[PDB]
Design a protein around this ligand. Sequence first.
Ligand SMILES: *[C@@H]1O[C@H](CO)[C@@H](O)[C@H](O)[C@H]1NC(C)=O
Ligand SMILES: *[C@@H]1O[C@H](CO)[C@@H](O)[C@H](O)[C@H]1NC(C)=O
Lengths: 33, 33
Amino acid sequence: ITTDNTFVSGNCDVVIGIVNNTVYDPLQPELDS
Amino acid sequence: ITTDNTFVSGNCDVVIGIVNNTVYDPLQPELDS
Ligand SMILES: *[C@@H]1O[C@H](CO)[C@@H](O)[C@H](O)[C@H]1NC(C)=O
Ligand SMILES: *[C@@H]1O[C@H](CO)[C@@H](O)[C@H](O)[C@H]1NC(C)=O
């Protein structure tokens, strides 16, 4: 799950069926490296 | 106004009716931090 394929919206307390995970921004390896 | 919803083309000098404001790149806070 990458933020050039997903987008940020809303909060996790309303939608039903949402699950715990981590979403890997492709900007993160660029900024960490 | 996000660069994930707008794109990079042109300048202030061609298109009629442009108003002066700021554009919040969603990359900009990670660039700053
Ligand atoms: C319907 O979805 C909820 C939330 O995802 C889940 O807890 C529930 O078990 C589901 N219903 C069935 C019959 O599995
Ligand atoms: C994981 O999802 C649950 C909902 O099942 C939520 O309450 C929790 O805040 C989430 N995050 C965690 C455990 O870091």
